[PDB]
């Protein structure tokens, strides 16, 4: 709109997007630790057996 | 973004005070029984 509102809402949009990208690029660090428990339960016989 | 913009204080006055320290596991907690200190003759019940 040619005002500072148009600038500041753009800076609000970039700061919204900076949260999500660092979230999901951090998610595969945790999704690895998710899956390794799901593969260490796939080959898991109980100690009682 | 990355904000982290919470400001710090000015390192205030650090006095020595007879309080009561114990440690419970990893954490280190006061003990306080506030009867003879703040509620002795005040005639208001302890909460």
Curated annotation (Swiss-Prot), chain B:
<comment type="similarity">
    <text>Belongs to the herpesviridae major capsid protein family.</text>
</comment>
<protein>
    <recommendedName>
        <fullName>Major capsid protein</fullName>
    </recommendedName>
</protein>
<comment type="subunit">
    <text>Homomultimer. Makes the hexons and eleven out of twelve pentons. Interacts with triplex proteins 1/TRX1 and 2/TRX2; adjacent capsomers are linked together in groups of three by triplexes, heterotrimeric complexes composed of one molecule of TRX1 and two molecules of TRX2. Interacts with scaffold protein; this interaction allows efficient MCP transport to the host nucleus. Interacts with capsid vertex component 2/CVC2. Interacts with the small capsomere-interacting protein/SCP.</text>
</comment>
<comment type="function">
    <text>Self-assembles to form an icosahedral capsid with a T=16 symmetry, about 200 nm in diameter, and consisting of 150 hexons and 12 pentons (total of 162 capsomers). Hexons form the edges and faces of the capsid and are each composed of six MCP molecules. In contrast, one penton is found at each of the 12 vertices. Eleven of the pentons are MCP pentamers, while the last vertex is occupied by the portal complex.</text>
</comment>
């Amino acid at each position: 709109d040619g005002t500072g509102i148009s600038l500041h809402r753009q800076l609000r949009a970039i700061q919204q997007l900076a949260r999500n990208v660092q979230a999901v690029l951090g998610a595969f660090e945790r999704g690895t630790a998710d899956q390794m428990l799901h593969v260490l339960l796939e080959k898991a016989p109980p100690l009682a057996l | 973004n990355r904000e982290t913009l919470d400001e710090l204080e000015s390192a205030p006055q650090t006095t020595r005070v007879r309080a009561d320290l114990v440690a419970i596991g990893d954490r280190l907690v006061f003990l306080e029984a506030l009867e003879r200190r703040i509620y002795a003759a005040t005639n208001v019940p302890y909460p």
